[PDB]
Amino acid sequence: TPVTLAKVIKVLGRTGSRGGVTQVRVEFLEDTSRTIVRNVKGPVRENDILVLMESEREARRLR
Amino acid sequence: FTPVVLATPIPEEVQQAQTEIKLFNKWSFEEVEVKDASLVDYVQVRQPIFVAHTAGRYANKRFRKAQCPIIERLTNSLMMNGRNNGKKLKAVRIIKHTLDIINVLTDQNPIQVVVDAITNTGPREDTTRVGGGGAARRQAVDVSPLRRVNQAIALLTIGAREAAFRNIKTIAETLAEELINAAKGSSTSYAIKKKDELERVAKSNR
Amino acid sequence: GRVRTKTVKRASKALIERYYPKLTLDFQTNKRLCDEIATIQSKRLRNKIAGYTTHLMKRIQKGPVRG
Amino acid sequence: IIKIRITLTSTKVKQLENVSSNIVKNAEQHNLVKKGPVRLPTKVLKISTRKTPNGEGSKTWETYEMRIHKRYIDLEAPVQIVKRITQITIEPGVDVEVVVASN
Amino acid sequence: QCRVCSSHTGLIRKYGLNICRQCFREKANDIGFNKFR
């Protein structure tokens, strides 16, 4: 199974109608040349570590 | 181990177990294994406690929560149903019983079994109910490691309590049962079920 | 917001305006100095003023102020 | 030869301590044997009072307070010293009590 | 009744004072009850 490892490097803020999901810029761990735009449902800090499945998916803005 | 005789002497089994560098009476934290890098620093428990009963004031800082013992954390997440609220002695004894079962379940390291359960039962990616205009579709998010561990311990304790209700089995046996069906995920546990379904609807919704 | 009431800011302004010499970066000496130079009716408000003259004293050693 | 125990009760600590230090120094400056002004715990009598006067708005609550302080001094003196000291020390706010027995 | 304003109602019958709450709140400062907290 494809377990992608992520590294929350930059916190962008909070989105969603409810205002809960964090917009986050991710430095890929295994291949450090990939920087993904990811959404997180949970409390995140800087230099964190996520576990994604589709590293080629990006997220502009949330309603 | 060089024993010491006082006037009122400490029982020999205590002295022996703790001067043999054993952190409980039947277990040790020096043998604990984490699989992902995301769980390493959010599950971390390297201080030996004999009771899994700490006056933790970690509810004052959000990340500070991740430095409170995971066995004490699963212990306080046992205490969920409204009738058992405000009873930590019950949960601690029950966890000690569970550990007495995972040993006699042909598993040499109950602590690594639990940690591997926590590693296996935390959902990688999830969904959120984002607007989209009335008919709210579900955006595939990627849940945090902190909430991964949270949701893990949650699904575990809840599945186990939901199983141990209205059946003769004691809570420790369905908690060991859950933690072992989830230690190495078998799709016979509640937590692996729900994790796989959350990641499945997260997959279908992207 | 811990915004210092106008009495503290004004008294800091004046105290540094005529007594720049004897004040340093330290609150502990600015305090007893605020006891020996001024007559403040309370210890709390004197700690207020002397502490703000401490912060301001830390701001004037770097550049020229509007005073 | 009378061995007497005195007990003060007051809400204002300044008047109570005025009377206490007065009796202390006045009792030692004419040579008497005494146990110094022992200080009983200040009992804080509180009264819970509803915020709602007129039945408008939800029910939230409040509290009133009183601080009551009590002291005691033990002495040995004749009849005249006790009479005179009791007459001279009378103050408002402070309530003095003179007991003679030791049982 | 409240020994101040002819009121059967509001009576603080405690400690033998028997003032209704409205009048007792006013006479509170003259009795000895003051606002601390």
Added chain:
Amino acid sequence: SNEVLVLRGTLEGHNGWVTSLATSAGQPNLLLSASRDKTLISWKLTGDDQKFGVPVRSFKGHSHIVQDCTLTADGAYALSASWDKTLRLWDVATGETYQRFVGHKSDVMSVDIDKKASMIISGSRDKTIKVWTIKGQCLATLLGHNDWVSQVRVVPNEKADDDSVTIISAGNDKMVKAWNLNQFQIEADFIGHNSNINTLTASPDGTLIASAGKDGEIMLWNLAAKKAMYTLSAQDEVFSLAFSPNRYWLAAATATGIKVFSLDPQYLVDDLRPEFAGYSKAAEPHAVSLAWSADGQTLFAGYTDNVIRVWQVMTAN
């Protein structure tokens, strides 16, 4: 050919400013330090290039910050002057307060005991220079300062105490004063300072006075002649002065660093400024106290970052 001071490491165990230092003669391994953590620490030093071994004792007993301290010539007692309007006499061994000196009406800023350890002077912020026995009894009340009394010192006799018992004080009324404690009266009025005098010290022989303060003017007087000598410009504020036991050096504690002057031949020997990590230049810790060792080879310095930094004299090419 130079005589170089080298940073030998750091002594840290305080929570507040190291406001005073005092060395010993009986045991040159002992250092007493009074701080703004309301405690005094006595150290037994093991001199290595980075760290110094054992921190012996703590002396908790002062309600407010401890300002000044002094040891005895054997190293058995301590004398601490605090902001709690009191002084104390400790045992450097156990920490036992042998006596509490209670008399002042404000913060005691300085203390020093005489040569034979029998007369204890004290200067405070209530413009009072009190003189006590070793039993806690005030036998003198020397008033005269119209502002603060920042420092009181006993001058080292040279004629083996030939009935002349003199003490020198530095007021914030911009004056130095010399008292004769044989009849308890003023003996000399040293006028010349333009701002607040922060410190003063008497030379080893007992004929020189060094007083400096906020003006940055290290003024030298002759006390045996009772006449003004001269003035050396130390630019920034000087908090503490001290004369070397052997050499003719004068190390001052300036708001920038630690300026070591020479008096014969006349030149600035050194300007000691230790490297600070992560601070602005208007945020760098300064020297608030300094003590010379028993042989003039070691210079201890109590700083404002709660750390006692030490220097040692070598000889260069």
Added chain:
Amino acid sequence: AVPSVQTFGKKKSATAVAHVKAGKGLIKVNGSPITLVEPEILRFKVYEPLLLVGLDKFSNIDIRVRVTGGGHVSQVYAIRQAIAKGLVAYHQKYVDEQSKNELKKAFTSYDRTLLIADSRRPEPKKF
């Protein structure tokens, strides 16, 4: 006059006074041994100041403990804190300083409440 050292210990309005004197080596809370505590689970907590620095440190001192206020847990924490405190204070006044400081180092390394009381005082209900 046997060399004695008295140190208290507080947890949530439960205090334990600990009298560490020089004896054969006996440890007792409320005239009963430390082996038999009321809570059987919290037991090991009252052991943790005895194990964290070695079991021999007690061969020279007889330790007393009396507990008032609180419940069972509050008083368990009270007596383990009173024990640790009494130990490092007897070692401060009687034994040398380095032993006492290695003892407070051993104590602080694991539980920083063994030497400092609980700083979560009961909240004023705020009317």
Added chain:
RNA sequence: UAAUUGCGAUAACGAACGAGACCUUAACCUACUAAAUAGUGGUGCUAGCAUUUGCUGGUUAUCCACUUCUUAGAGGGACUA
């Protein structure tokens, strides 16, 4: 800027009361200055069990010292350092 709270620009420049603030409270003080109407330790009188020191008590005055715990204060303390 939490604020019509200020800095600044300016046919506007003052000045008053609003806001704050005055007031009453909390948590640290092995440092003060102080105790049979609170308590601890030591000592005697005394009980039991072990006896090798020990263990658990009784004695509102047999005396002594303490306030480390309880308690009246004074200080301090914070000033967004």
